[PDB]
Amino acid sequence: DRINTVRGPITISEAGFTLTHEHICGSSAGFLRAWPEFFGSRKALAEKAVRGLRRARAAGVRTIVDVSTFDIGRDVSLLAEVSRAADVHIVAATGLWFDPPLSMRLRSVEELTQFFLREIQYGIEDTGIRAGIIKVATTGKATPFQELVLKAAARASLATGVPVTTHTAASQRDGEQQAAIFESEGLSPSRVCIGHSDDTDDLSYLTALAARGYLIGLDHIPHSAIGLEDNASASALLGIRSWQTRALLIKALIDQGYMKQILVSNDWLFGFSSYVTNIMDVMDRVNPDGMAFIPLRVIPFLREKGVPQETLAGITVTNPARFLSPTLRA
Amino acid sequence: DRINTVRGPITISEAGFTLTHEHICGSSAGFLRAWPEFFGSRKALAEKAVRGLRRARAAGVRTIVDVSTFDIGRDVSLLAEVSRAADVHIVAATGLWFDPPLSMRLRSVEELTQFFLREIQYGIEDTGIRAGIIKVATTGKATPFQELVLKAAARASLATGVPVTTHTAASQRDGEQQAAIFESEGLSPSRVCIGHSDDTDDLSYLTALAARGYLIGLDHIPHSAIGLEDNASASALLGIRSWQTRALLIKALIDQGYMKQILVSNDWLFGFSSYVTNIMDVMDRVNPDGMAFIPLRVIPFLREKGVPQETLAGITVTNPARFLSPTLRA
Numbered sequence: 042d043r044i045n046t047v048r049g050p051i052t053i054s055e056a057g058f059t060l061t062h063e064h065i066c067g068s069s070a071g072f073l074r075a076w077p078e079f080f081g082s083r084k085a086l087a088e089k090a091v092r093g094l095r096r097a098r099a100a101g102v103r104t105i106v107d108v109s110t111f112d113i114g115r116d117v118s119l120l121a122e123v124s125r126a127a128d129v130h131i132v133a134a135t136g137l138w139f140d141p142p143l144s145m146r147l148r149s150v151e152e153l154t155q156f157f158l159r160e161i162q163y164g165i166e167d168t169g170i171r172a173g174i175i176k177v178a179t180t181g182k183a184t185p186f187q188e189l190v191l192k193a194a195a196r197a198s199l200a201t202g203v204p205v206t207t208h209t210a211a212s213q214r215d216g217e218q219q220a221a222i223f224e225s226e227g228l229s230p231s232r233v234c235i236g237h238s239d240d241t242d243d244l245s246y247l248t249a250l251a252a253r254g255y256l257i258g259l260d261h262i263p264h265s266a267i268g269l270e271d272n273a274s275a276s277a278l279l280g281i282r283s284w285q286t287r288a289l290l291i292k293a294l295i296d297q298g299y300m301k302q303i304l305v306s307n308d309w310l311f312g313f314s315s316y317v318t319n320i321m322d323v324m325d326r327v328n329p330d331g332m333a334f335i336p337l338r339v340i341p342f343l344r345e346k347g348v349p350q351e352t353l354a355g356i357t358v359t360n361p362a363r364f365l366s367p368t369l370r371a
Numbered sequence: 372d373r374i375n376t377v378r379g380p381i382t383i384s385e386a387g388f389t390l391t392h393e394h395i396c397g398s399s400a401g402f403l404r405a406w407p408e409f410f411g412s413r414k415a416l417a418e419k420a421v422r423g424l425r426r427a428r429a430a431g432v433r434t435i436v437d438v439s440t441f442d443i444g445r446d447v448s449l450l451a452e453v454s455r456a457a458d459v460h461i462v463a464a465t466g467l468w469f470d471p472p473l474s475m476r477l478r479s480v481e482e483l484t485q486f487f488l489r490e491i492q493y494g495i496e497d498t499g500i501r502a503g504i505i506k507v508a509t510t511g512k513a514t515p516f517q518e519l520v521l522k523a524a525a526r527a528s529l530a531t532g533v534p535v536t537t538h539t540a541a542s543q544r545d546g547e548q549q550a551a552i553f554e555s556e557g558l559s560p561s562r563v564c565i566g567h568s569d570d571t572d573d574l575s576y577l578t579a580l581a582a583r584g585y586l587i588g589l590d591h592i593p594h595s596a597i598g599l600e601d602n603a604s605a606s607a608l609l610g611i612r613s614w615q616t617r618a619l620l621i622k623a624l625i626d627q628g629y630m631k632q633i634l635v636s637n638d639w640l641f642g643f644s645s646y647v648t649n650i651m652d653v654m655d656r657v658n659p660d661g662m663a664f665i666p667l668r669v670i671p672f673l674r675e676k677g678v679p680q681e682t683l684a685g686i687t688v689t690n691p692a693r694f695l696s697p698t699l700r701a
């Protein structure tokens with residue numbers, strides 16, 4: 042009935058236009074507190090985020106799902122501050138990404154489940170803020186630990202109704218492996234979003250997962266190093282496929298009849314310490330619209346390509362509400 | 372003239388009997404704040420630490436150097452709380468151990484230097500507490516990143532006068548490689564302590580480093596899985612050499628004339644999340660004296676073996692004061 046946000050619970054109808062895979066900051070556990078100057082200052086980072094969120098709001102965005110986990114250096118207090126200042130709802134996450142420290146890496150599936158349940162039911166750290174989604178990741182074949190992470194995520198999802206969203210090496214078809222693990226735990230595909238899906242041109246892989254009930258996250262739309270092939274680091278991160286090429290996969294999926302399974306986002310950020318120094322500068326040059334990229338550029342583009350405005354609204358409003366709403370299996 | 376502690380600066384003479392390589396808690400960045408229940412509770416951990424520190428104080432210990440770095444999940448506020456409650460001085464550290472997250476791993480030697488300088492000159496996080504030692508580590512041949520870490524540590528040491536202490540895979544003679552890097556940066560051996568040195572039976576390796584001016588840290592004295600060969604995990608961590616065997620290396624070094632280069636400790640802890648679950652229980656069974664092990668057991672043992680009480684006092688009081696005192700090279 043309600044979705045947990047960093048400012049408290051909201052009703053489903055209050056979500057409105059939602060970006061399902063974003064980040065205020067891409068960092069590491071403890072980093073922001075230990076070396077804020079890496080980002081100018083904590084203040085500068087917050088202001089930058091507020092400005093970006095306000096521009097996105099101007100464009101129609103009401104809610105963003107920040108999928109930063111503990112290992113992504115998620116700072117809920119920062120999230121709460123920025124949500125209040127920008128007047129944009131922000132859903133926080135639990136789960137683990139691909140940079141877990143030893144204290145996490147050595148845990149059993151049972152312990153990991155407890156930790157995820159903690160963040161969802163009790164609250165994150167001592168803030169009382171509860172997570173509204175579980176984030177997991179693989180980058181090719183799952184490691185044995187990654188397998189434990191996926192099982193624990195499925196278990197926490199099963200107990201709480203909270204959805205699961207993932208990071209994948211799409212080109213390697215990681216989605217297939219994740220699905221298999223989740224299913225083995227009895228999790229329903231409809232509670233799972235297979236992210237970074239636009240990173241691949243293989244529609245056969247995407248339609249196959251969609252046919253099974255999975256949500257497909259087309260969240261790297263503005264990710265492109267075209268014009269910067271000069272830059273190896275940027276190139277390795279963003280790829281050389283155009284934003285138009287990525288956006289067209291959205292239309293392809295709709296054309297195949299999977300409009301109800303699609304989730305779109307930018308996978309944007311305002312700070313990024315987990316990569317080469319100065320990567321943010323490069324990114325901001327590439328996509329000055331930041332998180333407003335989807336509503337300002339993608340939507341109109343799709344409309345122009347023949348996608349009905351109504352369909353577009355269902356993808357940006359309806360689908361997310363259905364996904365985000367905590368749902369227990371019968 | 373003064374040494375920085377978690378409660379502020381103290382004069383050299385206020386240090387007294389000091390344990391140079393200890394930890395209040397062995398964890399990971401952000402862990403303690405995110406999952407305190409892993410340790411019962413934050414409160415339970417603090418009480419346990421206070422009780423342990425008070426017993427150590429009863430035995431004569433005045434100061435402990437907590438060598439937990441950011442990646443060891445160092446929580447200075449915890450350190451400050453416990454120092455106040457137990458009335459034991461605690462010196463905090465900067466540096467990096469062997470579990471750095473991506474945000475650290477991707478940094479240049481120049482950036483790393485800035486971060487260490489920050490913690491030493493400005494303060495840790497927003498606490499205003501300044502580090503009094505720089506901790507570094509290798510576990511066999513240094514990785515390229517570990518090499519950057521050692522150079523940055525040497526640079527921060529050179530600028531501030533603060534000593535450097537290390538973690539080594541003694542059996543692999545890591546000390547040799549560390550020394551070479553430090554020397555290449557122009558750091559004086561007398562500002563460096565090569566730790567976990569009692570982990571090896573090779574006196575030739577130890578006397579060689581001592582001859583060069585390095586301080587030798589014999590800090591794993593009570594580390595022993597004898598009686599627990601049954602337990603693979605404990606065995607891999609503690610080894611099967613007796614505490615007596617380790618303690619005798621202290622006497623061997625004194626006999627060779629290196630009394631002024633020796634530093635002794637327990638490498639103890641009150642909480643430990645970076646290993647198998649329940650490892651603390653095993654450890655507490657092995658050494659119920661915890662940090663009081665050195666004064667209660669080792670000292671008398673050495674005395675019995677013919678080491679003059681005066682020599683022992685110089686090792687536990689004098690050597691540490693000389694090491695800890697910030698010293699700029701001429």
Ligand SMILES: CCOP(=O)(OCC)OCC
Nearest residue numbers: 064067068113308315316
């Ligand atoms: C916060 C996540 O960073 P990535 O997953 O993608 C960046 C937008 O890869 C970073 C190493």
Ligand SMILES: CCOP(=O)(OCC)OCC
Nearest residue numbers: 394397398443638645646
């Ligand atoms: C806090 C450090 O832990 P270790 O270096 O030695 C434990 C006393 O190795 C732990 C993996």
Ligand SMILES: OCCc1ccccc1
Nearest residue numbers: 058100101340353354357
């Ligand atoms: O109110 C703006 C939300 C929205 C804008 C454009 C297309 C679909 C949904």
Ligand SMILES: OCCc1ccccc1
Nearest residue numbers: 388430431670683684687
């Ligand atoms: O006051 C006790 C300090 C100390 C105790 C025993 C041997 C050397 C030093």
Ligand SMILES: [Zn+2]
Nearest residue numbers: 207208209237
């Ligand atoms: Zn991702």
Ligand SMILES: [Zn+2]
Nearest residue numbers: 063064108308
């Ligand atoms: Zn992401």
Ligand SMILES: [Zn+2]
Nearest residue numbers: 537538539567
């Ligand atoms: Zn160590």
Ligand SMILES: [Zn+2]
Nearest residue numbers: 393394438638
């Ligand atoms: Zn240690």
